[PDB]
Symmetry: C4
């Protein structure tokens, strides 16, 4: 109740956005949730004024990202109220998803962790892509004839690929062949490998963040 | 040899205790078994009562040690199930014996270690959670807009799209809500890749947390080694 | 795979062995194949009989050494499959040849390292395991009370919720049991979220465990060079 | 911008999409031809790429460029062979050799090589552990579930199908143990899965960490 200011306001606000999309809402509740949005919207309008008009920070600073979150929090929901006539106007209040990211740290840290690992992270992604395509290609050739409706194309087998490789596994597409299921099992295993490859990179990324502070204060110790 | 001999004493009693709770929830339990499982609970409740006195009657052991988390579990382990026995009349009373879940926790170590790992990395850990929540909603919002019309039974509301989103993003995928349209399936794929991304984030923070835990012992090792 | 043909000689034989055990369980196998697969088992078992005699008879290798686990695997590999062959009349005898699952573990350099990594983390690893059990049960208890009346056959007891709990918490999730009410599904999401939390803990502990093995790899750096 | 400057990786994207596009049933005659023409242009592009990497030798005195040559050679020859040999519509599937093209002119992969090489003994050991456990669990589930479910657990290879599905934590739902004894096993298999995930993650984390130790030795020299 001391630090989470804007993030707390976003909580019922974004829940209210979700509440309006529920079918069979009574006129009372339909308006009550809309009124809830208005109050939360009106709360951010004070917040926008509190940042713009009050100008006691220092001499040299950068506030471009922070103001942008406050600006979009009041303009987009207002533009929806004015321009959009359909009930789908309240979906535009989703811009309040930027609000919890505003006053939270870690995101400047994640920025430089992802920056120091961008070279390696993009590499894992394209590896995932290459593996996905190949894994789908094999599953297509093996299965296309038995299941023309499920494995009839590379895209169709690609659906099975991302589902199986990421180890999500819905169950709507399953290889029926022995040769297919042996491939399937190998996709699942190599999935576990990719899981750990993301974890390996990021753990080395977060380590080198602390290592930067340890060699930063270590060189400062002299 | 050492980890399975030091901790399993006070914590051991919770195992048959918590299984006895789970046993009394099964329908068609014969009176013989019904009473025997209740009798088992009472014995373990009795066993924990002597454990309560052991921490209360013992006044001297060293100089200064904290026993607030240790005694609190010992108190709750005998207070709750007895209060439920007398105040609640329905057979649901023994569900309060689930308080013994705290018994194996602060009986061994690791958890005090886990505490300071979770404390020194709380900034990042809470940040990942809020990233999960934000990505969860945005993804669900998209899934709703894409597939509310085609297949109205699912994805017909943000809540329903959020139900799919958690199932998909956590890479759980029950398979009760699966997008039909190509546009929604590409999104679904993007959710599953970013799912592994979050898995790597949790594993990334905690790997750095437990690493600092050991290197914090070096600050105690550099001061006085031999 | 080019240099690992004549390197794990004792482990390579286990591959066709274990796959034969799997083949003899497939229903409606032809009489010839049934006999041929059983013949393959006896040749591999025969091969281990030479392997046992090679390690038992020959003993001239150094002065100070310890090979208790290595002999333990080889002794079982010839005694157990033979005992079943003689004593078991049912076709299930060939299942006992799964003893050769220990054979790949015999010549691996990895498992000596994994053993001491698990030994260095035993305190933490059992801690994460009990944390899984506690969270499992607590979540099951919650899922039980919520879904009792709505879903009688699928959430009617704690064990039924426990089944859902491991299915959900480990993030397996077949789809056989799912909370139906809003209340239960909010919990469900939190169980899945804590799944990712537990996953990261196991990875965190073990990553620290293998990091400390590099710390242990300062024996040749501080003493030799 | 910088990595997306060489067309090697960029041209592969619409190339591989074109391979996937032709597998789709009920396509328009226009697109069917158009997508093939796109593959021919991309093929000709890689031919020009092949010529540059074969004729230029002025850069440096003595080094190695074997993998890049191998990828450029395979990117033109494999499709060319399919152009000449394959008469069926399956000819365009051989353009999936351009899966080596994103890997070609990109870093991380020289790192991923030595990271796998540094933990080579460890990584295979996890895989063989996975196999042993996979079998042991499948053998167990077979004996417990074979009578009640002959269609699902009637043989070891059938239980092995479940074992990968379950242990890799994919878990479709086409095979689920019924008996209490079988279900307690199932839960225990799911648990041990989380540990194997962590093992892969642990090994690879230690692999990438040791590469950073070498980066400290590389910063010590230069
Ligand atoms: C590399 C290990 C993963 C492969 C294991 C998968 C088992 C293959 C499934 C065989 C089942 C036989 N069939 C046709 C009845 O399904
Ligand atoms: C950016 C991640 C890529 C995910 C790839 C997923 C491809 C899904 C396409 C499946 C086609 C769907 N359907 C029903 C038309 O066949
Ligand atoms: C190691 C944790 C695994 C524990 C999960 C086992 C769940 C118990 C199975 C309950 C289902 C029994 N039955 C037949 C009543 O449904
Ligand atoms: C970790 C928090 C995320 C949990 C999200 C769970 C969404 C539950 C809403 C599903 C809709 C329920 N119902 C019955 C109305 O369909
Ligand atoms: K999973
Ligand atoms: K699943
Ligand atoms: K399913
Ligand atoms: K499923
Ligand atoms: K899954």
């Amino acid at each position: 109740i001391y630090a989470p200011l804007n993030a707390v306001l976003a909580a019922p606000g974004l829940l209210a956005v979700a509440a309006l999309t529920i079918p069979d809402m009574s006129g009372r509740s339909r308006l009550a949730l809309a009124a809830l949005l208005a109050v939360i919207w009106g709360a951010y309008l004070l917040q926008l004024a509190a940042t713009l008009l009050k100008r006691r920070a220092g001499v040299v600073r950068d506030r471009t990202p922070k103001i942008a979150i406050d600006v979009l929090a009041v303009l987009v929901p207002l533009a929806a109220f004015l321009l959009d006539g359909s009930p789908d106007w309240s979906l535009y209040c989703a811009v309040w998803l930027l609000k919890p990211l505003r006053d939270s740290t870690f995101f400047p840290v994640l920025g430089r962790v992802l920056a120091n690992e961008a070279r390696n992270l993009i590499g894992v992604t394209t590896l995932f892509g290459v593996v996905l395509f190949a894994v789908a290609l094999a599953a297509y050739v093996i299965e296309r004839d038995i299941q023309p409706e499920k494995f009839g194309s590379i895209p169709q087998a690609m659906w099975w690929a991302v589902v199986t490789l990421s180890t999500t596994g819905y169950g709507d597409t399953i290889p029926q062949s022995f040769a297919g299921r042996v491939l399937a099992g190998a996709v699942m295993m190599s999935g576990i490998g990719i899981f750990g490859l993301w974890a390996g990179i990021l753990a080395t990324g977060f380590y080198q963040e602390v290592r930067r502070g340890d060699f930063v204060r270590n060189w400062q110790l002299v």
